[PDB]
C-alpha cells in the first residue's frame with residue numbers, strides 16, 4: 001500500500017527518483033557528480049573541506065531528502081576511502097557529517113550509503129515514455145571512471161523490480177488462506193514463482209555490464225563500511241554530531257527488502273535458527289527504510305504459508321510452494337557462481353578472505369542461506 005511505500009511498478013524502489021537538488025545545495029551536487037574526476041586528481045577531500053555547512057531545511061519532500069542522502073552518502077564514501085588504496089580518513093568534517101546525520105535521523109537510516117540509496121534511489125529513465133529496461137536507464141552517481149557502478153546498481157535494480165512483480169500477489173496469498181480458497185492460493189504461488197524465475201533471467205545481464213577486476217578492486221572498495229573493519233577498527237567520527245566514532249556496515253543486498261520478504265512469506269527460517277547468517281540479515285533490516293522494515297515484520301505477524309501448505313496433503317499445492325522455494329534456490333546458486341567470478345577468482349589472482357559486509361565470512365554466509373533455502377523444500 002501507501003503506508004508501506006510499495007510502488008505497483010517498481011516495488012521497494014523509489015519510483016521516479018529526483019535527479020536535482022534545490023539550487024541552495026549546488027555545492028553538494030557539484031562534488032557528487034564529479035567524484036571520479038575529483039578523486040583521481042587528489043582534490044576531493046579539499047573540495048569537501050572547503051564546503052560550508054548547509055541546512056537540511058530547504059529539502060522539502062521525501063524525494064529531495066532521498067536524493068540528498070544519496071549525494072551525501074556517495075560523498076562520504078569518496079571522502080573516507082579516497083583513491084581506494086588504503087589511505088583513509090577517520091573523521092568526517094562537520095560541514096558534511098552534520099547535515100548527513102540530521103537528514104539520516106529524519107529518514108531513520110544510518111549515516112552511510114545503503115542499498116536503498118545507491119540502488120533504489122540511484123537511477124533515472126532516459127526517455128520517460130519508454131519502459132524500465134537497461135537501455136532506457138542510467139544511474140545518477142558513480143565513484144570512479146570504469147568502476148562498473150552503472151552496471152552493478154542498475155542490474156541490481158532491474159532484478160529487484162522483476163522480483164517485486166510478486167509483491168502484488170502477497171495479499172492474494174493470505175486472503176486465499178484465510179478464505180480456504182485452495183485453487184487461488186495455488187495459482188498465486190505459481191505466479192510468485194514465475195516472477196522469481198524472471199528475476200533470475202534478468203540477473204543474467206550482469207556479465208555484460210560488470211567485469212571482475214573493476215568490481216573486486218574498485219567498486220567493492222567504495223561500497224565497504226566501517227563495522228568490523230580493521231582499516232577503521234573503531235568506526236568513523238561524525239564530527240559535530242556524535243562524540244565517539246560509530247560503526248555502520250557497508251552497502252549490501254542483504255539490505256534488499258524483496259528477497260528478505262520472500263524468505264518470510266515462504267517461512268524459510270532465515271532470521272531464526274542462527275547464528276551468523278540470521279543475525280546478519282536481521283541487522284540489515286535496520287538499514288532499510290522504516291516503512292520497509294515494517295512491511296517485513298507485518299508479514300511475520302500473518303499465519304504461516306509454510307504451515308498451511310504442509311498441513312494439507314495436497315500435492316499440487318505442495319508443488320506450487322516448492323516452485324517458489326526452488327526459484328529462490330536457483331537465484332542463490334546462480335548468485336554464488338557470480339560471487340566466484342567477481343570475487344573469488346580476482347581474489348586468487350592477487351600478489352581465503354577478503355571479508356564481507358560487517359566482517360562476515362561471505363562464502364559461509366551465502367552457502368548457509370542457500371542450504372537453509374534448499375532444505376525448506378517439501379519434496380526433493
Ligand code: HEM
Pocket residue numbers: 155156159160203206210215251252253254256259260332335338339342343355356357360362365366369370
Ligand atoms: C558482481 C555481482 C555481485 C556480487 C559480487 C555479489 C556479492 C554478494 C556478497 C559477497 C554477498 C554477501 C553479503 C554481503 O557481504 O554483503 C551478497 C549478498 C546478497 N546478494 Fe549479491 N552480489 C552481486 C550481485 C547481486 C545481484 C545482482 C543480486 C540481485 C538478486 C544480489 C543479491 C544478493 C542478496 C539477496 C544477498 C543477500 C543474501 C541472500 O539473500 O542470499 N547480488 N552478494
Ligand SMILES: Cl[C@H]1CCCC[C@H]1CNc1cc(Br)cc2[nH]ncc12
Pocket residue numbers: 114115118119156220221223224225250251252253254355356357
Ligand atoms: Cl562484497 C560485500 C563486502 C564488501 C563490500 C560489498 C559487499 C557487497 N555489497 C553489495 C552492495 C550492493 Br549496493 C548490492 C549487492 N548485491 N550483492 C552484494 C551487494
